[PDB]
Design an enzyme around this catalytic site. Structure first.
Site, PDB file in Angstrom:
ATOM      1  N   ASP A 192    -135.410 -17.439  20.139  1.00 42.12           N
ATOM      2  CA  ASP A 192    -135.112 -19.157  20.053  1.00 42.12           C
ATOM      3  C   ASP A 192    -133.767 -19.290  19.677  1.00 42.12           C
ATOM      4  O   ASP A 192    -133.040 -18.585  19.169  1.00 42.12           O
ATOM      5  CB  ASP A 192    -136.335 -19.453  18.924  1.00 42.12           C
TER       6      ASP A 192
ATOM      7  N   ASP B 236    -133.323 -21.019  16.981  1.00 43.77           N
ATOM      8  CA  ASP B 236    -133.040 -21.462  15.610  1.00 43.77           C
ATOM      9  C   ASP B 236    -132.310 -20.244  14.823  1.00 43.77           C
ATOM     10  O   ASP B 236    -131.916 -19.306  15.415  1.00 43.77           O
ATOM     11  CB  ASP B 236    -134.773 -21.526  15.140  1.00 43.77           C
TER      12      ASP B 236
ATOM     13  N   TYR C 287    -157.358 -27.154  -8.253  1.00 41.94           N
ATOM     14  CA  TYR C 287    -157.981 -27.447  -9.530  1.00 41.94           C
ATOM     15  C   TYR C 287    -156.826 -28.645 -10.351  1.00 41.94           C
ATOM     16  O   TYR C 287    -157.259 -29.863 -10.768  1.00 41.94           O
ATOM     17  CB  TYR C 287    -158.636 -26.570 -10.411  1.00 41.94           C
TER      18      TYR C 287
END
Lengths: 747, 747
Positions: free
Chosen positions: A94, A96, A355
């Protein structure tokens, strides 16, 4: 070999005409398969008759096996090359940084280390793919660019980009099926050949060699974009110099890897922390309601382009929302609602992200990072979308006001927070016009000398800080109960976890000969550790661990000493790594960046103030003349705009004048006066009342007074915005005091 | 024992007065430490003088070691209990399903299996914490509820909840520091004791025993909430029956674990897939622009409360955006832009989420899932926030129109998609009033018999489907080239990955004696596998693998056969697991749920239409009378509202009548007529023109005509909305045809 597909003629008579497409992974293999088996149309395109695939150590050994290479050969002759099963190897990675900068760079380094002649005469190739594509509405053929410089240069010559959409293809998986078909139609044109030059050997030894000093020297400068002449040359000759690839892509990959762990010196935050802060400012601006950690992490990943996994994002958010003695942040960005961690486990004992909730410290963030200055910072554009700014410029030097410790790939970053009072005094002496030794501080900055001292932060530390030589030491506290023959540890050195300290003491057998039992009875904030000694050992402990000038015998016994090592490595605003010696240098370097921001703030606010004054004056005039106008008598928008034009109402840009979010002064001057009559035609019925008219008139008077005050502030000495800077400093100090008084929970 | 803190009197004279607080994890340990060391105030509160901590197999062995238990003892006498170091063990776990339903249930099962007498006489305790807290603006003492039924019952008696905020505390880490202080102030009141009854032994053997059939029988019913009488009893006596805990919390945990892997029969999607679809509908409603997979996953986690990690979310999004022969979705929700996977690796070869983008199939989603029907479905409320609906009711039975295969904890779910034409014919025969055998299908549904057939989907399958006995079989295709002595595989059985098939063939040595080489030359969609045989083996292959009636000799050789096993296990709308025998039953069960939705749609649209007609009539009247009114002469909002009231303008709720997002018919009738004059006072200046007035008048006429048409549709036979259902069926069919024609890329 697994995940290997051979061709018909591989190793045959025309084996030299064959190709070996080295794919990065499974997605690259799928794209290569789609391209190769595409040969039902466009027969000129490549197929499996000459092209094979392989997936990218065991991997390099497999590539060698399929290539039929010999480790004892140099391949200096054509006859030696003729024994190869494949004519060339093409790396399909790629665009990138992680793909072409790391994997392709590693492959190039391997080939150069083992068979340089293959690279010299030509054997290693890469498959360039269109990085950026621009589509025109109604046009079937996009405009394809292979580098960002090409796209930028093309965009500078375009009249308008409203009808053009821009798509970035940094990964091989981002190419659509039709785009893959178009690419493999011209496949023979898009494959380039690597060439090895003289400087390429040195560059390879710098990046992939064991000489770390040369790597540190090279990483001290930002990425140098490819020159337009070099871009034309590489596109024309179909050849990538290895030195250019190493200097650009590998250097960018290394600088991005280092930048993740080393923060900027202007704000003291890395790229991830800057993204998190920007996302928190954006999310909690409308309402400062509590939001769960995973929800806020999802929001950050959605808005600020946080492509890393949720684990690291949640960990960073929790760390930014932590507040306990010895924590990284003395002034955390977020207010932690729940159990976010304790000093005993170093913050690793935080609750689950499902939480605990996070809330933005509005009173501290709105003062330390002004909202009016967020429109002037340089922002990072990720695939064409505006992500977090390149750097924040707070009112105070946040880089040195907070604790920090982050190792790097060769570099070390460790800072101990300075005292707030000393930093405030120095900044006020720099800014305040009439203040003792104000000109003296200017002379000190000019000649790079220190006058007022900086001391390590003693807050949230029930101990004494002592200096010996050029290093600082933090001491713990203890008491001795001779009746029970025990030693009670009441305070640990700075940033020393309780559990880790207890385990380190236990792991030492020599200390364990004298220690019988250790129990952790400490509170959430206060440390209380009871150490029971064996009978008749305290005198033996004193005798063995001899008391010295630096530390007491008990302190040497229990390791109640810490060394305040400081490694002042930071990232420059325009890329690169900068190393400082003292915190004075960091302060003196951060000061001009903030000093220059107030002038831009004031000028932009002056221009925007003029624009708002004009618009509100026109609106009040229309409010007064609405009864005369009788706007309901006219048919459509065009006639209403026409009659409004006859009465001399000026045409203004309603959207930009009200909200000039990212418009410069020149843009404001050139475009804000070329709009329509929406500012009048969009007025609601409730705004025609006398109360709204009076409110608008009072607002106009206030804006005129503020415009005069802005002119006066622009005429201020020594630099514009000095009084505003002092006011913001006082506000930040008050916010910090209020936070420290309420356990950093602004209630 | 690691992560264990002892007390002063543990194992001493008053060891029976001591307590052992078993914490769930690090956050629970931190909360327990904060509570225990809090004893600088409120001395009546617990401290380390009698309470210790421990963290929750090696864990159970450690708990036994600290408790000093003996495996050979029954503890039937008080003298036997007196040898224990701690008087009781208290489990400090969260109130969520994973904490109290799994860990606490496992601990209870362990204690009941090994020492039932400790539970009978009283030794295992749990720490109840306030699950829900309601805060009043201006009041310092919240209202704490330990169960959702208590909060619901309290809310039904409240006049208004505008000034009340509701906070859910399902985890121990969600409690703030002041809330932790308040809890440990009343600690002695909030710890309950477990009691073992007669049915508790049977319930334990059902849930934790090896009898899977009883577990399947128990999981066939939804969760039964605790009765108000039982809640009062448990709160008064301070005792939790083990049977009640197992029947409620453990059953809810098991049903949530099963529900994640088994989908509802109304829409064929699990909870995660429903969340993803709702997030996609919400995100791409305004604009259907391409968004990256990680960005959309972050948006889903932010909005639809997706607390699971980003890995599973991204995988599910990719799977929902996949389209290839043999994929799970024949009609995927999202349009995949990039490389989302291939049939060779079963979709596991998809690109990185950072590169591939997702786009919503607007033409298919807007037709299959109507937007007007999304306001009538029952929604899931997560911690007081409205998450994705409980179930979607599409126009067609999506549960049986798509492939599905998901194993469960004892259950199996595997469905093969039926033919679209047969399902369309059956649904049309059910809905259409004048259609052959329409009353016959009604009689068949009444008496549970089948008339029109359902056949497995043959689309995207270059093979032939054959039925033998009561099972369906899918056959592959092959050709034989005697000149080269090879067998070319052109098509694999349904949902058989190419790489997995090749590896399975290779792993069989017997087949490998006849096979020399296998090469994968298949395209992205078309399969082409060349199998080379050893010299003079084809006749041997025919001789050894004898040809049978079911499969040919070559098909037996290459495993070109698949069995279409169907396990029709689904989730009922009101909880539980339902098992079907044929797809006919699923269709006949889904039909009434959609049939009943059209009546609600029509009635709600009728009432909303009346409300819009009233508002637009009043607005047009004000537009006509604005010149007479001269609204600018009045001072403030109150005077303007007063004069508008004098002229007889009706007061209407502007926010709710325009956007009744989730208001029922009774709510619309009772509240929409109790608003203010914002609908007039907020009119913009551009709306006073004659063009806007004409547009509003035309809209009023259209709304009146639509109201008459809605009355006619409500008077329709056999059931209201039959013609609308037929129109939506035709639209869905057209959208599916357009998608299949364009490779599911609506371009």
């Amino acid at each position: 070999v697994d995940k290997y597909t051979r061709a018909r003629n591989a190793g045959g008579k025309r084996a030299q005409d064959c190709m070996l497409l080295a794919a990065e992974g499974d997605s690259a293999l799928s794209l290569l398969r789609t391209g190769l088996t595409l040969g039902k149309s466009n027969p000129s395109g490549p197929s499996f008759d000459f092209c094979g695939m392989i997936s990218l150590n065991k991997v390099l050994q497999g590539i060698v096996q399929v290539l039929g290479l010999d480790f004892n050969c140099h391949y200096k002759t054509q006859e030696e090359r003729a024994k190869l099963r494949y004519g060339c190897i093409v790396a399909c990675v790629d665009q990138d940084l992680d793909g072409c900068g790391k994997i392709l760079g590693l492959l190039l380094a391997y080939f150069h280390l083992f068979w340089p002649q293959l690279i010299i005469h030509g054997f290693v190739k890469r498959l360039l793919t269109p990085l950026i594509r621009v589509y025109e509405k109604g046009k079937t053929m996009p405009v394809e660019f292979y580098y960002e410089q090409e796209f930028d240069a093309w965009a500078k010559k375009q009249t308008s980009l409203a009808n053009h959409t821009v798509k970035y293809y940094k990964g091989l998986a981002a190419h659509d099926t039709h785009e893959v078909k178009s690419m493999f139609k011209h496949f023979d044109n898009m494959v380039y050949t690597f060439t090895l030059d003289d400087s390429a050997k040195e560059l390879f030894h710098i990046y992939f060699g064991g000489e770390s000093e040369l790597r540190k020297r090279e990483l001290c400068t930002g990425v140098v974009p490819l020159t337009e002449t070099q871009t034309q040359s590489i596109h024309s000759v179909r050849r990538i110099p290895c030195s250019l690839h190493l200097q650009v892509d590998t250097k960018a990959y290394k600088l991005d890897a280092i930048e993740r762990q080393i923060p900027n010196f202007l704000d003291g935050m890395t790229r991830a922390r800057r993204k998190i802060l920007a996302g928190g400012v954006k999310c909690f601006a409308s309402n400062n309601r509590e939001r769960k950690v995973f929800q806020f992490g999802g929001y950050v990943a959605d808005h600020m382009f946080y492509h890393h996994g949720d684990m690291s994002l949640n960990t960073s958010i929790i760390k930014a929302a932590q507040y306990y003695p010895g924590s990284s942040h003395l002034y955390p960005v977020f207010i932690g609602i729940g159990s976010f961690g304790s000093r005993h486990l170093g913050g690793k004992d935080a609750g689950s992200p499902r939480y605990i909730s996070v809330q933005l410290a509005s009173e501290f963030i709105k003062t330390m990072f002004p909202a009016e200055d967020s429109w002037l910072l340089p922002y990072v554009f990720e695939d064409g979308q505006r992500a977090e700014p390149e750097y924040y410029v707070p009112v105070l030097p946040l880089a040195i006001m907070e604790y920090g410790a982050n190792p790097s790939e060769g570099w070390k970053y460790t800072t101990w927070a300075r005292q707030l009072e000393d930093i405030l005094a120095l900044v006020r002496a720099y800014v305040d016009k009439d203040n003792p030794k104000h000109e003296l501080l200017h002379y000190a900055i000019k000649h790079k000398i220190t006058i007022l001292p900086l001391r390590p932060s003693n807050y949230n530390f029930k101990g004494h800080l002592k200096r010996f030589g050029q290093y600082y030491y933090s001491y713990g506290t203890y008491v001795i109960s001779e009746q029970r023959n025990i030693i009670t540890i009441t305070e640990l050195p700075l940033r020393v976890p309780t559990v880790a300290y207890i385990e380190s003491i236990k792991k030492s057998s020599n200390r364990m000969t004298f220690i019988e039992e250790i129990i952790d009875y400490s509170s959430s904030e206060t440390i209380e550790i009871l150490v029971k000694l064996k009978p008749n050992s305290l005198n033996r402990i004193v005798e063995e661990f001899k008391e010295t000038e630096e530390q007491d015998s008990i302190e040497n016994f229990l390791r109640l000493r810490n060394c305040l090592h400081s490694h002042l490595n930071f990232v420059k605003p325009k890329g690169g790594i900068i190393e400082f010696n003292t915190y004075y240098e960091i302060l003196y370097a951060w000061l001009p960046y903030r000093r220059e921001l107030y002038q831009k703030r004031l000028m932009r606010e002056h221009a925007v103030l003029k624009l708002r004054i004009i618009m509100e004056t026109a609106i009040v005039r229309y409010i007064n003349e609405s009864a005369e106008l009788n706007l309901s008598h006219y048919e459509d928008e065009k006639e209403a705009s026409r009659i409004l034009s006859e009465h001399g109402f000026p045409p203004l840009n309603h959207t930009l004048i009200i909200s000039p979010e990212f418009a410069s002064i020149e843009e404001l001057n050139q475009k804000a006066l070329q709009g329509c009559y929406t500012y009048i035609l969009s007025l609601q019925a409730r705004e025609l009342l006398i109360a709204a008219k009076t409110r608008r008139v009072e607002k106009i008077k206030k804006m005129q007074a503020r415009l005069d005050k802005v002119e006066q502030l622009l005429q201020e000495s020594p630099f514009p915005g000095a009084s505003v800077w002092l006011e913001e400093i006082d506000a930040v100090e008050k916010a910090i005091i209020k936070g420290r008084n309420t356990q950093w929970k602004f209630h």
